[PDB]
Amino acid sequence: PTGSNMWVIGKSKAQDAKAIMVNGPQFGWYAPAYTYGIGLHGAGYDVTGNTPFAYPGLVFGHNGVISWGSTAGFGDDVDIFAERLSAEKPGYYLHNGKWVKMLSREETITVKNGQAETFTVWRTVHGNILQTDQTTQTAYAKSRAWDGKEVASLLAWTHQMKAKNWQEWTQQAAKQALTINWYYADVNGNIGYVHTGAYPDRQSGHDPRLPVPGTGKWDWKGLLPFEMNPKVYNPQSGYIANWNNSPQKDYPASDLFAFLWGGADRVTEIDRLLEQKPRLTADQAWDVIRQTSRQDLNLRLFLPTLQAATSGLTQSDPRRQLVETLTRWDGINLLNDDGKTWQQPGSAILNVWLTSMLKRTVVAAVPMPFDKWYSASGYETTQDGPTGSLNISVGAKILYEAVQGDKSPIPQAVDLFAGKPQQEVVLAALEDTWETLSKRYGNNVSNWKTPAMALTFRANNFFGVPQAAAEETRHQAEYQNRGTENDMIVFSPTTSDRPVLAWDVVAPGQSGFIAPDGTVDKHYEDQLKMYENFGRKSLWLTKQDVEAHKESQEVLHVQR
């Protein structure tokens, strides 16, 4: 699920509590809500929280002893095998010296007010065929390390909810086969992290970023043991922070071209806030959502470069004055009172500058039409706003390595600046930026009212399929680079006699029900304003707390 953040604060770093867990899974924003609030009590379970698509297993929740969360792992658990075909053996591929018969199945798509279509799906020992290049006599099969373990993963996410300590919980973490960061906290203040999933034990020499021959010599050896999954229990830092960044030193990322783990990483924004104060309260931990949601992610990366490039320029030089505006700014975007524009113009300045930089550097070094994979600054959006999290663009991460000079560990096989001093290129981009922005907004930087990003709870689910009527779409003025939902669990708080306190927000509301006559449920939209203003509602666990907050009840008698 492309974005997701988490910060877990342990005993050594928590104020007025023994542990604090704050999770912000980013799936995009939908109506009705992407996640589902649910409490389960009996059959060995005693839990509360919320979970995507109402899975049996709560991804975000606690059981009164321990609490858990997730963020997308993005490890490389998928490789593509280039299968060798034969004109003499249609539907076969060469594997371990023999012509092996592909599996195939016929599927018929029934179409409302149209003619049905039938097609075939093919599969090899390495997975389903994605495509076939018949001129090259190759079929590409997608091999997932978690193939065969999909159901076990769903069950691992359910059974983990019964764990009472780290050892029991990691026994279920070892069964979860998708590439997912899992997080743990408990009543005693212990905290932990596991970069869960099945990862292939590849042959020596296998470059996991590119396909390998499917004829047998490059077949995976099997799966790596759980010992190899990156994990930490009670880190000496006292905290665990993640925003889909690398789990651990030397661990390799997904092979997706647009995904990189490099020196420029948005997780640094969470890390600086956690290291800043010796200890954090649950309220301060919750406030990290607001701050990171509004943080421009590029300012910190490129300010030093911009400052150096403009250091000897005159006070009247507009390239310098754009950088002075940026230097004065902390990069936190805030709406003006019109509910449309941002108080400061820095994001616009960075967008234009970075777009110009990338056009001049990474884009110019990559052949068309692949240059268009590295041109985005990451800021360009639509009137409805971002469909997910915002990140530092892939082109920006590459550019960051280049502007770090010999501080970067990445050999610059091609000088992205093409023989020109970097200062010249950075200043040219600033000249472009001043031209573009001063023509649009005038020469008085202090009155520039640049467009803020908005947020939309879309009526189509992430697949692009309607899950509500189009009129059910909801809008919020302020885009916030945060979880679709946010949940926080606090263990052994000094502000209560309860051993655990928990809060969440499931917007627009718990219910998506609309009666036939159009009456929307009483819980159709009661968490929308709360979402917008960084509010939250208590999650109950105990029978006493559920009962005290009881709105309605139903008792059923059923036999299986």
């Binding site: 179409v111 020499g205 092979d255 692949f370 985005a376 689910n461 159009g518 009840q553």
Partner: protein
């Protein structure tokens, strides 16, 4: 009671299920889900199984084929068939619970049928354990833990080698798409541990073994969406042009993004 399931909803309508065995507990969960999110769950079911066109028409045919081409349902069924009685009870109870509410809905549709079923012109059918498993499998696994662009990467590598020659093309590929970068900020501090498997440029043998790849990068064939998040259902040609324009403009953060 063994047979008793108690459902308590709080002040935000969040359900709490009280039951005495696995099947009853998950039945309560499925029941409340069908009460709260039946249309959403029905469409998620169709999304995860590639049966959207059946109710929404021709614009979702390519989508349905793509979903079906990306998994092997009999393998999921064999996983479910292997489950112990206790594990099967989670899936079966859940489905059974949904079904109890769905039957009540189709018996008194005038007040209980979600409005959207009338708007979209169909009624909800019962759920099986496979359907429940497929909500998860189709979302978390088949979409969110299935990220690879190796064929696109081979396409880019072919182009880099054509522009720069073979060794330099590969070296520029390593600059743009590094295997690992020691300066990446890591969730686990280096004082704690490091990953024992050391991946580097030197040892790779497989990049040299593949065919030069010249068809359109496959990322250009993902179905384009507009600003409402809806599928555009375009010709293959206009789809590729839409994805390229959207990706050049917004990259991974944009409309054709990740």
């Amino acid at each position: 009671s063994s047979s008793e399931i108690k459902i308590v909803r709080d002040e935000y309508g969040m359900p709490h299920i009280y039951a005495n065995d696995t099947w009853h507990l998950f039945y309560g969960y499925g029941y409340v889900v069908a009460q709260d999110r039946l249309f959403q769950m029905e469409m998620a079911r169709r999304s995860t199984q590639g049966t959207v066109a059946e109710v929404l028409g021709k614009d979702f045919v390519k989508f349905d084929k793509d979903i079906r081409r990306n998994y092997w349902p009999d393998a999921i069924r064999a996983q479910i068939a292997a489950l112990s009685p206790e594990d099967m009870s989670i899936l079966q109870g859940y489905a059974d619970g949904m079904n109890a509410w769905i039957d009540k809905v189709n018996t008194n549709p005038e007040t209980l049928l979600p409005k959207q079923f009338n708007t979209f012109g169909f009624t909800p059918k019962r759920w099986e354990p496979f359907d429940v498993a497929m909500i998860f499998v189709g979302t978390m696994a088949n979409r969110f833990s299935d990220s690879t662009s190796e064929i696109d990467n081979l396409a880019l590598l072919t182009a880099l080698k054509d522009k720069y020659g073979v060794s330099q093309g590969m070296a520029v590929f390593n600059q743009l798409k590094w295997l690992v970068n020691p300066s990446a900020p890591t969730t686990i501090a280096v004082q704690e541990s490091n990953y024992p498997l050391k991946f580097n440029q030197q040892n790779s043998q497989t990049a040299a073994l593949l065919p030069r790849y010249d068809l359109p990068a496959p990322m250009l064939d993902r179905p384009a969406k507009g600003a409402d998040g809806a599928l555009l259902a375009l010709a293959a040609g206009k789809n590729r042009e839409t994805i390229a324009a959207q990706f050049a403009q917004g990259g991974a953060n944009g409309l054709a993004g990740y």
